[PDB]
Amino acid sequence: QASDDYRDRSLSPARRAAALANLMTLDEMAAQLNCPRAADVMSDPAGFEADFPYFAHGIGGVYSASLEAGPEDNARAVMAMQQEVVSRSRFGIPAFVFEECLHGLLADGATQFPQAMAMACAFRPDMVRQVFEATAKEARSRGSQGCFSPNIDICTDPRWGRSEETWGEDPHVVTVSAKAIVEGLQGAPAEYLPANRIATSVKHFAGYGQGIGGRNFAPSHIGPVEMQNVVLPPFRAAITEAGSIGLMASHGEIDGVPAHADTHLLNDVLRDDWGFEGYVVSDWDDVRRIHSLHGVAGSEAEAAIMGLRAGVDIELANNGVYLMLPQLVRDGLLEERYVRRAAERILAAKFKCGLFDMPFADPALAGRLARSTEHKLLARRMAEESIVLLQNEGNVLPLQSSAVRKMLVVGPNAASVHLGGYSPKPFVGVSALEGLQAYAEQAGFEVEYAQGCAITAGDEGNNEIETDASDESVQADPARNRRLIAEAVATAQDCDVIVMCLGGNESTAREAYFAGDSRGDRDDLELIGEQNELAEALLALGKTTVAVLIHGRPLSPLVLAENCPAILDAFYPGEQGGHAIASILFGDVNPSGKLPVTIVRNVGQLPGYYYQKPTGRFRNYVFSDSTPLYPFGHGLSYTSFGYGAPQAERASIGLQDRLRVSVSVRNTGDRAGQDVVQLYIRDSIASRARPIKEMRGFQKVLLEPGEVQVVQFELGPEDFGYRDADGKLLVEPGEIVIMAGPDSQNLQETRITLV
Amino acid sequence: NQASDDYRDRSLSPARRAAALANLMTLDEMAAQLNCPRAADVMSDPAGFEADFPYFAHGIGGVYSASLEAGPEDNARAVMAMQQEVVSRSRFGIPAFVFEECLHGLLADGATQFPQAMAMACAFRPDMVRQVFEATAKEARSRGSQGCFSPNIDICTDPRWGRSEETWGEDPHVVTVSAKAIVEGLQGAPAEYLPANRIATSVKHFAGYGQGIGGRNFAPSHIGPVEMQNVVLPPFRAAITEAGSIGLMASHGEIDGVPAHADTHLLNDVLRDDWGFEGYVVSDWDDVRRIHSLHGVAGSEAEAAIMGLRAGVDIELANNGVYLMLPQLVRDGLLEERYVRRAAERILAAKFKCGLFDMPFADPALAGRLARSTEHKLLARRMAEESIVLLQNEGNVLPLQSSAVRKMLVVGPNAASVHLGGYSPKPFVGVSALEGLQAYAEQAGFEVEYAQGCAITAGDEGNNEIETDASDESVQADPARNRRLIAEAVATAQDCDVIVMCLGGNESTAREAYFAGDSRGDRDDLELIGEQNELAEALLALGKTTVAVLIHGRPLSPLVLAENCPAILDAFYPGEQGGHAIASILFGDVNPSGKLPVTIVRNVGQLPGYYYQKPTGRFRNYVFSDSTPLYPFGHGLSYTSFGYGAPQAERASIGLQDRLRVSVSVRNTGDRAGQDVVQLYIRDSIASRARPIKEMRGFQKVLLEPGEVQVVQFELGPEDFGYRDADGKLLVEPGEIVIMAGPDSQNLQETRITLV
Ligand SMILES: [Mg+2]
Ligand SMILES: [Mg+2]
Ligand SMILES: [Mg+2]
Ligand SMILES: [Mg+2]
Ligand SMILES: [Mg+2]
């Protein structure tokens, strides 16, 4: 360690970081803890230094350097900025260049895969890794070596406008997805990142999705055992198994403790229990908000101090409160060892991502990868694996294209592309209307379009031209909608097939920003506005009619589910989604998605997530069907599947043993198809009450007609036990019920005993 | 505690008499004091009961619900006979605790039915609350009951909960103030022994029962330790450590996987060690067994008994309970006898304190004089007059003028029926809205007609006087029949110049969802159920003078009615004299002065909406939806008007341990006398843990003549300005406190002080 040299590429990132940090002044180390927006650094670095003198020593990171630039211009703009940063540091430390990679890179010209919750419907973690390996390549070639993704929050409240960012309600699903995403973006765990990979910052640590009322920023009520067995597991796997380099903290509070000042979470759990060696980044301006919003720090200075000592390493903010850290050290108010501790984490991450050893970006590579043929094909395939068949009464689907003459494609989400939050605007891709038009051209039937109704005012017809940004969204006028509905009814008279494209859009489910009176959470889970009136008016014509749901949050479409026989749930299907919808509507693709959330019947029945305690849904609501509209794991096929009971290899095992379980699944229908075999356990008696069922595995299987297969699962003590308030795994003797089936309701079971 | 202590010495303290007695008792005799089955089988056949349950050879801890279907004198005599059977079996003559329900009066045939608990919370008259429960205790003790499973001091944060009406609202200060007045009314002011004609309280449900997710009865609550210390516990802490509640009952539910009936931290560390409780912990009905059979935490019934007893449950409320295994478990070596002795001694000390050893069992003739006495009926009338809330009075439709009315239509599902709420004797006995208005018309010289309007539940139409069984599960009223009933009321209304709509919910749409079968009582919607809005809009379209009176259990969010009907009274369940109090307020003889003790959200999708949000709790609003409350906490109008000055603190800066005087002037700026509730709130601007944007710390109902001014005085201190950490330690921190005052939680002026 005495001989350690930071210029030695054969040394580990942590040892190069320590050797470099020993050469640095207080001001140089403190500059590494700032991450403003890139825009003002890129446009006038000399003026940025004038306004923010720390920039004489370089910078920790910048956020969103893509700006409005296409792939090659983005790469060149980052190279130019990096040269400005590296020229200011005595040691040539480049900036981290942070972007969003929720479902593809948030940058002009980049491939837009289906939204996270859409992809969660696929139950194909292998394809999730591919999607984010492709995202990483696009990001890194354009100069970004880190991102503020994945969102591995748990969606327990679909009122939340950010639900679409999550992989659903289930800890197992969110955990498996977390690992696939981190390995996709970073590569498999290694001392150094492979080339063409980027650092992840798993967010938001921890409990952000449990905000009361589904209101963004609102406190979460999470007990310590609930924290350990529901909310933390995806983070623990992302950190301790897949090796995520970064982590982002949560806006919110738990029991009065803001996450950005939560030493128990940010230090005791993350550093001591889990051994995290990467960086903790704040969410936007959330260190200041320990004071300005939560009222826990008495000033900006004290907020800076609380966040740093709690364990936040780098502040994502313009003119952040971390700009005060050098003077607070020099004034005696803050121990310099906390500046050094954070800067050493940042530096080791920068070494591990190759910043010191590699070019800044690769403009020509960036141009080849962006929306490449291979990446668009992947986005199409992901959508084909994700779309969920909710119901198909009377086998209306698949449509037979030879028997179609004139199809009406109608609805607020027919002609527009819908990509979800964190997508480059304007949206680029294949709307449902365009997918069906292109399919009709090949198949030889006619397609007619009608608006039907609007969801938000001004969002009608095409989505190709960039809609007025920063303009506040307004609900669509009901009177105009009823005239649009009558127009659609009239146009439908000579159509033999109606395809209604309904749901929500990026204005009715969205992140409610801190500024002003920004809104994005809903107090109702039905289809908003006049869409139900539209669907009823079309369904009354007695035509062959189906619905395709395009939307962000999980929706509870009761009127539609009651009156429309066939419903496809596509969430946001990505830039190739329209082709995938057409292929599924006509049975060229057999739908195979399953719901990664429970769909409750109405918002007054929340919470409805499937892993309730024995008392959680013990009592039902008066005069009201209290069953879910669709249970977790639900999804139909154009074929049928028969299941045998789960078979354990032994009837009894020791507290530390593993156990093999097998399930026989057979295609009992007419068409090749995929089903998702799902494995659940119940810990019958426990030292703390446990859910009535908890998913511990799943497996999507392709089966030809009449084909039968034995699907194998392996469970261990990490599956049969639970973690206590301190994170220690308890395995206790007694009965475990083991359940398997095609969803969380149609289960068969066997029982084993732990001894 | 001395060796000379003698359990027969009435000059000794209850605790010392209980120790002296316990030293004389066997394991089996002490264990028998830990059982509390339902009274009926003990009373009907005591020899058969002892045959079925051998511990009864040594007496019994308690019985539950001995009133049965008997009136006051027969009640008192039936308990005397049963107590003689009990006392004759105990080697030492230990009588039974006789536990009844006293939620809003004694749940027994012929007892005075006061307004429901949430209704009475609207009155902001804790002095009258104390009187109401003094009257209730008299009626209970004279009939042989010396303990009750009351008050319910849960916090109503989720109005979907079918038991909302049993609580005193959402605010910790209000529920704390109410809890102390109830305990001091039922038990008397804290004393070594209960005075005559008082009974023991068992404050329930410990702790967090109201926070069950989904508003679903029995469902887990998610409560952090600081929230628990500053929201849920303060009423229990005040009841236990200040008012001296002798008993306490635990909760059905779990927090973070820990059943409350097995929560050693709650039942021992906080209740025994931190607070110094010396009374008894009684289980809720069969909840010790359910540690095993519902929660899945105990591996067996024997393990459940052990968990409950060691956690700190002293007496099991159950038939054929798991505590019947306690003697054999001690003898088998699976349980230390000292836990049986710890529990039985608490029970015995409570019995001494309640005078069971030194008093007659009951008093049949006094029981007959007290039951629904003229003084108690008048108190029930006056309480309703103080509780009914004027929600809105657009254009000053109220008060009606009696001399100006000719023909009034009284219409709606809650007009002709009496509604008293859960935990009331059936069939209900009282003055319905219709009857109250008919009697007012007779004296006033105008006509009244009645129409059903619509039904809420099928078979519940017309008056509520003749008895029907509770074994017919309730079904919702038929919409087509209701539409015909709406048309009929429309026709009847054509000749009426005034329409009074009696709407809301009933004891079937808000009720306790019981354990057995598929019992239901919680709602996933807060609007008026069924066709009541249809009925209301049909009558409003006629253009006559129309007012609405709301009669219901849970807080309701009647958006349609709030938008379309200009004058709304909220009566909750106004007790057995409620019909008269409603009529008196409709015509101006009483100026309404109730205030809401909960926040009323616009719709169930905006829950939670309780006012004391953290700064982030309602930081963001719902897309395309008015996210303000429909009515804020503390809201209530008047037939006069009140002008408020700003709160004035006596000092701008005080020390951490100082008390502070604050005054608020209020002036009657209208033309008739009336009451208002002056309300004080604080905000701790900066705190080591984030605190609510405002927290009620005082209130005072005032009565003012036209033009009269009063300067209301409040005093605040460390317990008001600070907050309790996760261990219960009061933290007071230097820095700014905002002090706010006004007639409700939204119409406030403020001043700022500094703690140094
Ligand atoms: Mg929506
Ligand atoms: Mg077990
Ligand atoms: Mg607890
Ligand atoms: Mg109701
Ligand atoms: Mg303070």
Side-chain angles (χ1 to χ4, degrees):
Chain A
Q1 315 259 331
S3 69
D4 278 0
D5 196 327
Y6 84 89
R7 303 176 51 97
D8 178 6
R9 286 203 321 285
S10 53
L11 253 192
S12 79
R15 291 172 70 184
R16 303 173 66 179
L20 178 51
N22 293 332
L23 311 174
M24 292 173 65
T25 70
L26 164 69
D27 285 349
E28 289 167 337
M29 288 184 300
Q32 292 302 306
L33 314 184
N34 308 317
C35 186
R37 274 213 159 243
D40 285 6
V41 175
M42 297 172 77
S43 66
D44 191 11
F48 191 83
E49 183 168 334
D51 302 333
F52 303 103
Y54 79 82
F55 193 50
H57 315 302
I59 194 161
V62 298
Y63 177 46
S64 200
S66 48
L67 299 181
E68 281 282 19
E72 302 103 306
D73 288 330
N74 189 180
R76 282 184 293 265
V78 163
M79 292 152 76
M81 187 210 59
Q82 287 285 35
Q83 175 166 312
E84 292 285 345
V85 174
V86 153
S87 87
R88 282 171 160 86
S89 169
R90 274 196 306 161
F91 312 101
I93 309 164
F96 262 129
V97 178
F98 289 119
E99 303 287 335
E100 308 284 351
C101 292
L102 173 64
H103 60 87
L105 173 72
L106 203 186
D108 198 85
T111 315
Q112 295 313 298
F113 300 95
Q115 189 53 285
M117 185 164 277
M119 294 201 271
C121 294
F123 288 80
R124 290 294 301 269
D126 62 320
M127 289 183 61
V128 170
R129 192 203 54 80
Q130 298 176 23
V131 157
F132 285 96
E133 179 187 271
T135 300
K137 295 181 180 171
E138 288 190 25
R140 191 59 188 274
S141 64
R142 301 171 68 145
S144 170
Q145 335 89 324
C147 66
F148 299 152
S149 314
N151 184 315
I152 58 180
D153 301 321
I154 309 295
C155 181
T156 52
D157 198 322
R159 293 179 285 182
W160 192 36
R162 300 194 75 172
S163 310
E164 74 193 67
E165 306 185 27
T166 74
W167 296 70
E169 81 196 18
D170 179 63
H172 177 71
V173 167
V174 177
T175 297
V176 171
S177 303
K179 299 220 288 318
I181 298 163
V182 172
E183 298 216 7
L185 283 165
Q186 296 197 156
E191 174 174 86
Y192 278 90
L193 256 57
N196 306 318
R197 302 284 172 142
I198 74 189
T200 55
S201 320
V202 296
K203 60 177 189 201
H204 312 71
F205 198 62
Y208 183 45
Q210 285 59 69
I212 57 167
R215 307 187 283 262
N216 203 36
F217 289 87
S220 301
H221 295 246
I222 302 164
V225 173
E226 169 185 25
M227 178 59 80
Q228 284 280 342
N229 296 274
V230 174
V231 173
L232 287 181
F235 282 104
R236 190 202 261 257
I239 292 294
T240 74
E241 300 168 57
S244 172
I245 294 180
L247 172 144
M248 176 177 287
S250 163
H251 290 329
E253 61 143 89
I254 302 179
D255 209 35
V257 187
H260 283 70
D262 195 332
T263 302
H264 162 75
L265 278 172
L266 290 184
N267 201 92
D268 304 349
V269 169
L270 179 63
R271 304 300 182 165
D272 297 341
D273 293 5
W274 298 355
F276 180 55
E277 284 174 349
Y279 63 82
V280 168
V281 60
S282 82
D283 206 334
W284 183 267
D285 210 30
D286 269 337
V287 183
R288 190 190 327 267
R289 293 169 189 166
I290 298 167
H291 170 65
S292 62
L293 174 60
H294 287 291
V296 162
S299 67
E300 299 194 323
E302 193 189 19
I305 293 171
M306 289 184 177
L308 194 65
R309 307 216 273 233
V312 178
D313 301 310
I314 182 165
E315 184 194 19
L316 172 65
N318 284 339
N319 188 34
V321 299
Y322 275 15
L323 273 53
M324 287 170 183
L325 298 183
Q327 204 43 48
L328 291 162
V329 167
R330 282 190 296 261
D331 290 349
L333 303 170
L334 171 66
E335 312 93 315
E336 184 173 348
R337 66 171 203 271
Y338 285 105
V339 171
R340 156 75 180 245
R341 175 182 75 163
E344 201 165 313
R345 288 149 167 179
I346 303 299
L347 290 172
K350 298 186 172 200
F351 281 115
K352 179 170 187 175
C353 296
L355 311 207
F356 288 90
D357 307 321
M358 297 289 293
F360 306 131
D362 190 333
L365 177 61
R368 298 193 297 275
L369 287 171
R371 296 190 66 232
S372 72
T373 300
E374 177 196 44
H375 289 182
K376 286 182 301 196
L377 174 56
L378 176 53
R380 187 161 169 174
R381 283 257 63 244
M382 197 56 174
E384 292 171 353
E385 296 280 335
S386 305
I387 293 174
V388 178
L389 181 56
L390 295 177
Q391 65 193 49
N392 192 23
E393 192 60 53
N395 305 307
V396 179
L397 299 175
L399 306 177
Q400 178 173 12
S401 52
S402 74
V404 182
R405 308 182 314 274
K406 186 172 187 162
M407 166 189 288
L408 175 60
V409 175
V410 47
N413 295 340
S416 35
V417 183
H418 293 275
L419 293 183
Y422 287 87
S423 304
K425 295 177 185 169
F427 297 165
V428 171
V430 181
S431 68
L433 176 59
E434 183 190 320
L436 286 157
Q437 282 170 338
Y439 195 97
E441 170 84 86
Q442 282 281 333
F445 61 93
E446 191 189 321
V447 160
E448 175 84 283
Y449 162 69
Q451 168 74 35
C453 68
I455 289 167
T456 43
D459 296 310
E460 302 193 24
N462 264 38
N463 215 341
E464 302 183 0
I465 285 76
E466 38 197 314
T467 52
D468 214 346
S470 95
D471 226 11
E472 295 53 34
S473 211
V474 153
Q475 188 160 17
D477 172 58
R480 171 173 172 74
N481 272 342
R482 292 185 164 87
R483 300 190 266 102
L484 289 170
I485 287 178
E487 285 180 23
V489 168
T491 292
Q493 298 298 347
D494 74 324
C495 300
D496 47 299
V497 170
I498 303 166
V499 172
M500 310 182 291
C501 302
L502 314 173
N505 60 27
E506 292 82 356
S507 287
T508 65
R510 65 170 316 141
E511 168 180 4
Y513 307 106
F514 181 89
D517 185 39
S518 179
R519 307 193 185 202
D521 318 301
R522 283 187 68 209
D523 58 0
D524 176 19
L525 301 176
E526 254 291 1
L527 299 186
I528 203 164
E530 285 67 58
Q531 305 178 80
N532 281 332
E533 182 179 338
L534 167 67
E536 300 221 87
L538 290 169
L539 286 164
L541 306 185
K543 268 62 189 304
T544 293
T545 300
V546 295
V548 180
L549 294 178
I550 294 162
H551 58 114
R553 68 165 39 80
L555 287 174
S556 294
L558 261 198
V559 178
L560 196 60
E562 181 186 65
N563 300 291
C564 182
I567 305 171
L568 248 27
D569 200 331
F571 280 92
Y572 292 132
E575 69 164 62
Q576 298 296 302
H579 292 313
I581 295 176
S583 296
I584 286 168
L585 280 169
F586 289 103
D588 298 342
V589 165
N590 199 344
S592 62
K594 311 277 198 171
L595 286 173
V597 291
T598 300
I599 304 294
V600 303
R601 285 175 186 275
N602 65 75
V603 70
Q605 304 192 337
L606 290 180
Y609 52 84
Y610 80 90
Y611 46 96
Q612 297 287 317
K613 299 307 189 68
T615 51
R617 288 174 61 256
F618 174 55
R619 303 291 71 183
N620 298 306
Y621 297 98
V622 53
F623 302 148
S624 181
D625 189 351
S626 309
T627 66
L629 185 63
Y630 310 107
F632 170 87
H634 171 84
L636 305 179
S637 173
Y638 296 154
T639 194
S640 67
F641 299 94
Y643 280 68
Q647 273 138 36
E649 194 165 283
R650 267 199 289 161
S652 156
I653 58 171
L655 298 189
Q656 295 311 303
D657 291 351
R658 300 194 71 81
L659 179 70
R660 275 174 72 105
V661 186
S662 83
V663 184
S664 167
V665 53
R666 176 192 305 272
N667 187 332
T668 55
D670 289 335
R671 299 168 173 256
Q674 284 175 116
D675 206 13
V676 181
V677 188
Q678 296 163 46
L679 183 86
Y680 301 78
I681 66 150
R682 178 174 193 182
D683 185 8
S684 292
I685 301 289
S687 53
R688 293 205 184 198
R690 288 185 69 171
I692 61 173
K693 51 183 79 150
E694 333 184 34
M695 167 170 263
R696 287 299 180 266
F698 62 80
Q699 179 66 40
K700 197 168 204 178
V701 187
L702 173 57
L703 296 176
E704 289 299 318
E707 182 179 356
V708 60
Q709 192 170 121
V710 171
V711 175
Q712 301 282 347
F713 293 103
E714 219 189 52
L715 297 173
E718 80 273 4
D719 300 300
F720 293 133
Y722 79 94
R723 297 191 181 277
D724 71 15
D726 307 310
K728 164 161 93 86
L729 180 70
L730 304 186
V731 194
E732 316 169 330
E735 185 190 63
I736 308 281
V737 188
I738 304 191
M739 292 156 287
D743 56 53
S744 62
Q745 296 286 160
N746 299 109
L747 298 171
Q748 299 178 246
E749 62 183 57
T750 191
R751 319 211 159 197
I752 56 108
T753 292
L754 307 172
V755 172
Chain B
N1 236 42
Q2 248 51 75
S4 79
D5 282 2
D6 192 330
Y7 88 84
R8 298 176 56 103
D9 182 4
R10 280 204 325 283
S11 78
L12 251 190
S13 78
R16 290 174 73 188
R17 297 174 66 182
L21 175 58
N23 292 330
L24 312 179
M25 303 174 60
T26 72
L27 169 63
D28 289 357
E29 295 177 323
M30 287 185 297
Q33 300 294 308
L34 313 188
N35 309 320
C36 187
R38 221 176 271 271
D41 284 5
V42 182
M43 295 174 75
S44 73
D45 190 1
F49 192 83
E50 180 179 335
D52 289 333
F53 311 97
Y55 77 84
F56 190 55
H58 320 292
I60 197 158
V63 291
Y64 174 48
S65 202
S67 34
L68 307 174
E69 300 269 330
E73 300 94 321
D74 301 336
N75 192 166
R77 284 186 289 266
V79 173
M80 283 154 80
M82 181 211 78
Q83 287 282 48
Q84 194 176 297
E85 298 282 354
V86 175
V87 152
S88 72
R89 276 153 165 100
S90 173
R91 195 158 56 118
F92 309 91
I94 308 168
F97 263 126
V98 179
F99 288 117
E100 300 286 347
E101 305 282 358
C102 293
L103 182 60
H104 60 91
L106 167 70
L107 204 186
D109 204 286
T112 319
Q113 292 313 286
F114 297 95
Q116 185 56 291
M118 187 157 275
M120 291 197 278
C122 304
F124 287 75
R125 289 293 299 278
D127 59 332
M128 290 180 56
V129 171
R130 189 205 63 73
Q131 294 168 222
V132 154
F133 286 94
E134 185 189 84
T136 299
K138 282 176 187 171
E139 301 197 9
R141 193 60 195 262
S142 73
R143 295 168 71 143
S145 172
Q146 335 88 331
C148 64
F149 298 152
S150 298
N152 177 317
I153 55 181
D154 301 315
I155 314 294
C156 181
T157 60
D158 201 319
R160 293 175 285 180
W161 195 35
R163 304 191 74 168
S164 300
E165 67 189 81
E166 309 183 18
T167 74
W168 295 73
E170 73 189 32
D171 178 58
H173 175 81
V174 160
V175 175
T176 292
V177 163
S178 309
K180 304 213 297 156
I182 300 161
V183 174
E184 289 176 313
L186 281 169
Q187 292 196 163
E192 179 182 54
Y193 283 89
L194 290 199
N197 293 319
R198 305 299 175 142
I199 70 174
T201 54
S202 322
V203 292
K204 62 180 195 194
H205 313 72
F206 203 58
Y209 181 41
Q211 287 58 67
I213 60 179
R216 303 188 287 258
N217 203 39
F218 287 88
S221 304
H222 297 242
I223 309 177
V226 179
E227 178 189 13
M228 175 71 72
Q229 280 289 335
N230 301 270
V231 177
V232 177
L233 291 182
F236 284 100
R237 185 178 179 119
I240 292 288
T241 71
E242 295 173 34
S245 178
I246 291 171
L248 171 142
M249 178 184 286
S251 166
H252 287 336
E254 69 144 86
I255 300 165
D256 207 29
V258 178
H261 281 76
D263 194 329
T264 301
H265 166 71
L266 222 34
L267 294 179
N268 180 80
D269 300 5
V270 164
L271 182 58
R272 299 305 177 171
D273 295 350
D274 286 355
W275 296 353
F277 183 51
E278 282 165 350
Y280 64 88
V281 169
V282 55
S283 83
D284 205 337
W285 181 265
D286 211 26
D287 269 344
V288 185
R289 186 193 326 269
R290 286 167 194 170
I291 299 168
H292 164 65
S293 65
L294 178 62
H295 291 285
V297 167
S300 58
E301 304 190 316
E303 178 167 44
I306 293 178
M307 285 184 184
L309 195 71
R310 320 248 308 277
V313 179
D314 301 313
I315 176 159
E316 171 187 42
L317 171 66
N319 285 345
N320 188 32
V322 301
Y323 272 16
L324 277 53
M325 299 172 188
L326 292 184
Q328 202 42 61
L329 290 159
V330 167
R331 285 190 296 263
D332 287 351
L334 311 163
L335 175 61
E336 288 146 85
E337 156 156 6
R338 77 172 211 265
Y339 286 103
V340 175
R341 158 68 184 254
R342 185 184 67 170
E345 191 174 320
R346 288 147 171 187
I347 297 295
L348 293 173
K351 294 182 161 177
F352 281 114
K353 181 156 184 181
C354 295
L356 308 210
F357 290 86
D358 311 318
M359 292 308 285
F361 304 135
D363 189 341
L366 177 62
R369 297 195 298 283
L370 292 176
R372 292 194 68 218
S373 73
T374 285
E375 161 182 330
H376 287 185
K377 290 194 290 197
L378 168 63
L379 179 57
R381 161 100 113 114
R382 274 205 315 130
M383 190 56 109
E385 296 179 341
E386 297 279 326
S387 299
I388 298 165
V389 178
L390 184 54
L391 289 181
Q392 55 198 57
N393 198 19
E394 271 164 38
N396 287 282
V397 175
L398 298 177
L400 311 181
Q401 273 159 339
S402 46
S403 64
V405 174
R406 157 170 100 61
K407 194 182 193 252
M408 165 194 299
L409 169 69
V410 180
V411 47
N414 294 342
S417 35
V418 180
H419 290 279
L420 301 168
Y423 283 88
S424 307
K426 288 161 168 166
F428 299 156
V429 178
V431 175
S432 71
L434 175 69
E435 190 189 307
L437 278 170
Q438 285 166 338
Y440 199 95
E442 159 142 20
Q443 254 214 301
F446 66 86
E447 190 179 326
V448 153
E449 202 158 330
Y450 158 74
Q452 178 68 22
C454 69
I456 292 169
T457 37
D460 295 313
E461 301 184 20
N463 55 51
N464 245 12
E465 306 188 6
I466 304 303
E467 338 183 313
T468 57
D469 44 12
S471 44
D472 279 65
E473 289 140 26
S474 173
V475 316
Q476 195 177 349
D478 174 44
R481 167 165 176 79
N482 273 332
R483 303 208 154 88
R484 303 193 291 271
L485 292 164
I486 286 167
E488 281 172 28
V490 167
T492 310
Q494 303 292 349
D495 42 89
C496 302
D497 40 312
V498 175
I499 304 175
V500 171
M501 318 190 285
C502 300
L503 320 162
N506 61 28
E507 292 82 356
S508 280
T509 59
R511 74 171 310 123
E512 174 182 5
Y514 311 102
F515 180 88
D518 188 28
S519 173
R520 300 189 191 204
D522 316 307
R523 288 189 57 208
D524 55 3
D525 177 27
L526 299 172
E527 258 286 5
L528 303 183
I529 192 163
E531 283 69 56
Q532 293 178 82
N533 288 325
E534 195 169 338
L535 165 70
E537 304 189 85
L539 295 173
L540 285 165
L542 306 191
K544 291 125 187 309
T545 310
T546 304
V547 306
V549 188
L550 295 171
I551 298 165
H552 57 109
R554 61 165 54 80
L556 288 171
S557 293
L559 267 190
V560 170
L561 194 68
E563 177 181 310
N564 294 291
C565 176
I568 306 173
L569 292 183
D570 202 334
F572 279 94
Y573 288 137
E576 62 161 70
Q577 295 307 305
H580 297 306
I582 294 177
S584 296
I585 281 155
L586 282 170
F587 281 104
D589 306 339
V590 171
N591 200 345
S593 74
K595 302 284 202 178
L596 282 174
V598 289
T599 292
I600 302 298
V601 300
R602 278 167 199 279
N603 68 79
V604 72
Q606 315 196 340
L607 292 177
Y610 55 82
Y611 80 89
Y612 44 98
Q613 298 289 314
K614 299 303 196 66
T616 50
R618 286 175 64 256
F619 175 51
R620 304 288 70 178
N621 299 305
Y622 292 103
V623 71
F624 303 146
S625 186
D626 187 351
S627 298
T628 60
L630 186 60
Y631 311 103
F633 173 89
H635 169 81
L637 303 182
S638 175
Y639 296 157
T640 192
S641 70
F642 301 98
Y644 281 69
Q648 305 206 246
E650 179 169 31
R651 292 205 279 158
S653 189
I654 68 175
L656 303 181
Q657 292 308 311
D658 293 348
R659 304 194 65 80
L660 177 73
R661 302 204 285 188
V662 176
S663 70
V664 183
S665 71
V666 46
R667 175 187 295 99
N668 185 343
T669 65
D671 70 357
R672 46 223 286 166
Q675 292 180 111
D676 206 13
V677 181
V678 172
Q679 300 168 35
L680 189 76
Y681 302 79
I682 68 147
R683 155 70 175 168
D684 184 5
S685 295
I686 305 289
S688 51
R689 293 204 181 204
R691 293 187 56 178
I693 65 183
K694 55 179 73 134
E695 333 188 43
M696 169 169 274
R697 290 298 183 264
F699 67 76
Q700 183 55 71
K701 202 169 215 180
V702 298
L703 169 65
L704 294 176
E705 294 303 322
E708 190 182 352
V709 176
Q710 281 179 30
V711 182
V712 177
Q713 299 281 341
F714 300 99
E715 199 173 281
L716 292 174
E719 75 274 21
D720 299 304
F721 296 139
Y723 78 101
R724 297 199 181 267
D725 69 23
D727 305 320
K729 185 197 176 195
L730 179 68
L731 305 176
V732 191
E733 300 163 354
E736 176 188 78
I737 308 287
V738 186
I739 293 168
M740 298 157 275
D744 58 58
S745 64
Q746 296 215 120
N747 295 95
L748 302 169
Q749 299 183 274
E750 54 175 68
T751 187
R752 286 170 154 76
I753 63 130
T754 298
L755 309 180
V756 176

